[PDB]
Amino acid sequence: TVCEGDAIVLTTTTNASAYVWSGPNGFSSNQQSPTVINAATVVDSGKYSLYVIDANGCRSEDTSLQVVVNPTPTTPLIVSNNTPICE
Amino acid sequence: TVCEGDAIVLTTTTNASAYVWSGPNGFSSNQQSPTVINAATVVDSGKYSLYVIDANGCRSEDTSLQVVVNPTPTTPLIVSNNTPICEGSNIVLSANAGAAGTTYEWFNASNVSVGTGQTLTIVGATVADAGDYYVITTLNSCSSAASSTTTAIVDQVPSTAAFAGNDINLCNSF
Numbered sequence: 001t002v003c004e005g006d007a008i009v010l011t012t013t014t015n016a017s018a019y020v021w022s023g024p025n026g027f028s029s030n031q032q033s034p035t036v037i038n039a040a041t042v043v044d045s046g047k048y049s050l051y052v053i054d055a056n057g058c059r060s061e062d063t064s065l066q067v068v069v070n071p072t073p074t075t076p077l078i079v080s081n082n083t084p085i086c087e
Numbered sequence: 088t089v090c091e092g093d094a095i096v097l098t099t100t101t102n103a104s105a106y107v108w109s110g111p112n113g114f115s116s117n118q119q120s121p122t123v124i125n126a127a128t129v130v131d132s133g134k135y136s137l138y139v140i141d142a143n144g145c146r147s148e149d150t151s152l153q154v155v156v157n158p159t160p161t162t163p164l165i166v167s168n169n170t171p172i173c174e175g176s177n178i179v180l181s182a183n184a185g186a187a188g189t190t191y192e193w194f195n196a197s198n199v200s201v202g203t204g205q206t207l208t209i210v211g212a213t214v215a216d217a218g219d220y221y222v223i224t225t226l227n228s229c230s231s232a233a234s235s236t237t238t239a240i241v242d243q244v245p246s247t248a249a250f251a252g253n254d255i256n257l258c259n260s261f
Contacts (some may be wrong), residue, residue: 026122045125
């Protein structure tokens with residue numbers, strides 16, 4: 001779970017002959033450590049998945065990670081300004 | 088259905104050996120979750136389709152999604168500016184007519200609503216009603232950029248009384 005504008009990092013720790021990653025915004029990678037989304041936005045929310053190809057070419061089961069990106073609040077306005085006052 | 092400038096997200100939920108997506112602006116993808124159109128425009132309107140290739144290479148039937156992008160209204164103009172008024176008078180500002188169905192909302196200098204319609208009337212206006220006004224044009228849940236800012240002028244009745252000097256009395260002079 002990250003705030004909008006922060007980075008989304010999805011990497012794995014196991015060894016593989018190949019990795020296969022897939023996600024919500026067309027995210028795709030084949031490396032132990034995929035390119036990081038440096039300034040994530042709300043479209044990056046969702047389910048990401050990864051399965052590992054071993055040394056002899058076999059494909060283990062699908063696992064997953066859920067990513068949540070919290071939207072930036074809007075810029076506030078100061079509306080009331082009871083400013084012209086005496087000490 | 089989205090407003091122009093918003094994002095179009097077309098993803099599926101089923102598993103596949105491959106996906107095939109196609110759409111109106113040359114849109115194409117083979118992933119469960121295609122790259123999102125982050126700021127869609129009117130050319131993105133239309134019929135999008137997707138069919139799924141299974142594990143053994145067979146192709147299921149075509150299904151579809153209709154996407155509608157509502158255009159941004161034009162930036163409104165303030166045309167009439169009955170602004171040079173004395174306190175107690177009404178301020179009358181009026182926006183140019185837009186597309187049929189256009190909703191007009193007026194905003195104060197402080198960015199708060201002051202009323203709706205092509206013509207904004209502030210009745211019994213006072214000095215606090217003087218200053219910046221702008222117009223927002225709304226259509227089909229889309230809103231355009233604010234109009235050029237105009238200003239109301241509310242004059243105060245001054246406290247100074249008229250006063251002439253004393254009488255002039257002349258001998259043989261015009």
